[PDB]
């Protein structure tokens, strides 16, 4: 069922700005939002998306959504920033990432399978693009900074996904 949406579809306003990277983004870093919520319907999921940029844009003083792709519990995908435009969600990983927000508080709960499944199937899609790279790194936000996103139980789930990795497993 899962299709990529545009930043028109959901309403979003212009950037202020827009930076860009080059080459294919060595990594998958995986948000929750917390607040807002899960989202089941695309009208509540495409208003999560503008609530997640009102944020950003109009209280922290951001050019964009922070986020490079949401995904809703409609198991729909939301483009934010895009794919090969500098981010504002990882500290240090910026500029060489994908940044992917499954909207909610998922700490406890896991997110439900279409959900999970268009995150995996976002990632799939920007490697055969090339957009990604075929050796990304998966991490969680928790492991860059200090954090609890993306929520204990979704840490856990994409520990198990491919590609996922611990910074600490190079010394030095
Ligand atoms: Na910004
Ligand atoms: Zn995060």
Same mark, same amino acid.
């Given at each position: 069922?899962?299709?990529?949406?545009?930043?028109?579809?959901?309403?979003?306003?212009?950037?202020?700005?827009?930076?860009?990277?080059?080459?294919?983004?060595?990594?998958?870093?995986?948000?929750?939002?917390? =607040?807002?919520?899960?989202?089941?319907?695309?009208?509540?999921? =495409?208003?999560? $998306?503008?609530? $997640?940029?009102?944020?950003?844009?109009?209280?922290?003083?951001?050019?964009?959504?922070?986020?490079?792709?949401?995904?809703?519990?409609?198991? $729909?995908?939301?483009?934010?920033?895009?794919?090969?435009?500098?981010?504002?969600?990882?500290?240090?990983?910026?500029?060489?990432?994908?940044?992917?927000?499954?909207?909610?508080?998922?700490?406890? &709960?896991?997110?439900?399978?279409? $959900?999970?499944?268009?995150?995996?199937?976002?990632?799939?899609?920007?490697?055969?693009?090339?957009?990604?790279?075929?050796?990304?790194?998966?991490?969680?936000?928790?492991?860059?900074?200090?954090?609890?996103?993306?929520?204990?139980?979704?840490?856990?789930?994409?520990?198990?996904?491919?590609?996922?990795?611990?910074?600490?497993?190079? &010394?030095?």
């Amino acid at each position: 069922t899962a299709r990529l949406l545009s930043r028109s579809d959901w309403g979003a306003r212009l950037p202020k700005s827009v930076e860009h990277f080059q080459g294919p983004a060595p990594y998958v870093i995986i948000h929750h939002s917390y =607040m807002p919520a899960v989202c089941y319907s695309t009208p509540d999921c =495409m208003k999560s $998306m503008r609530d $997640m940029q009102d944020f950003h844009q109009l209280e922290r003083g951001w050019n964009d959504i922070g986020f490079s792709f949401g995904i809703g519990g409609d198991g $729909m995908i939301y483009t934010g920033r895009g794919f090969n435009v500098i981010g504002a969600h990882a500290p240090k990983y910026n500029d060489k990432s994908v940044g992917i927000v499954l909207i909610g508080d998922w700490r406890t &709960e896991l997110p439900p399978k279409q $959900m999970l499944d268009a995150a995996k199937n976002l990632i799939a899609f920007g490697v055969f693009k090339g957009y990604i790279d075929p050796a990304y790194k998966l991490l969680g936000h928790r492991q860059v900074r200090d954090t609890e996103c993306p929520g204990g139980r979704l840490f856990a789930e994409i520990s198990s996904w491919p590609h996922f990795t611990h910074i600490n497993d190079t &010394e030095g």
